[PDB]
Amino acid sequence: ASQSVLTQPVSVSGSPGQSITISCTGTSSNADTYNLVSWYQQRPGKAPKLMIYEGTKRPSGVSNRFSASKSATAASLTISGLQPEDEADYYCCSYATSRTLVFGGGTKLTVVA
């Protein structure tokens, strides 16, 4: 049986001060897939960090420059006021089946200096 598969752009480039939006689109997915999307930031040489959960909720401690939106067809992470420290790989995650999770392939965000 088909399971949910999450796709993200392979790479995105941005300049400091700008805004970027990373999409997470699913196949064999539904509104609940996007309602449950969580986003993870992985800086070079660091462990991943939870940025968003439940599609749009931001945990305490996570910068207010990170926001997220979701529809019945996609989930998106938006980073406002881009800083060099935002250079990282970003992964979306949701359920592949009722009892298994899957990550998107990841998006490499380059901050152009």
Binding site: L36, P48, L50, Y53, P59, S98, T100, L101
Partner: protein, 146 residues
């Protein structure tokens, strides 16, 4: 709050390894715990999860019965027993807590379908290298069944 993994290292193809993770600074026995891995230069890949009780243990499709997740609540420990390892399994393995589920089900027992979750605490990860010291061509993979 921290998660510290152990047991990673060099293993020969077809070999076995047991990873461990020490948890501290939170009510371990009431939380779901996950294993996530990341092959060198590749993306995050979800491996497994276990509930408070160990009555629910779920695995990604590539596991095919080769890995067993387990936990020792009073010892604040999480394990991943891995057998029949191949070059496909070479990766950093991260021990991960589902901190969000705790705020909806504080027992960490119920395996409700598609429940609200958040992998909020991650270890630094332990490296597993399935190698014979040969190039990529010297590696194996799955037989394709099951």
């Amino acid at each position: 709050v921290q998660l510290v993994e152990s047991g990673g290292g060099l293993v020969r193809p077809g070999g076995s390894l047991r990873l461990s993770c020490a948890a501290s600074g939170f009510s371990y026995s009431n939380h779901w715990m996950h294993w996530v891995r990341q092959a060198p230069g590749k993306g995050l890949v979800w491996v497994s999860r276990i509930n408070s009780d160990g009555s629910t243990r779920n695995y990604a499709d590539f596991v095919k019965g080769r890995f067993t997740i387990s936990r020792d609540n009073a010892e604040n420990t999480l394990y991943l027993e891995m057998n029949s390892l191949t070059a496909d399994d070479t990766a950093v393995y991260y021990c991960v807590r589902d901190g969000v589920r705790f705020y909806y089900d504080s027992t960490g027992y119920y395996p409700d379908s598609f429940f609200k979750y958040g992998m909020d605490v991650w270890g630094q990860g332990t490296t597993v290298t399935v190698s014979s010291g040969t190039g990529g061509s010297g590696g194996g993979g799955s037989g394709g069944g099951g």
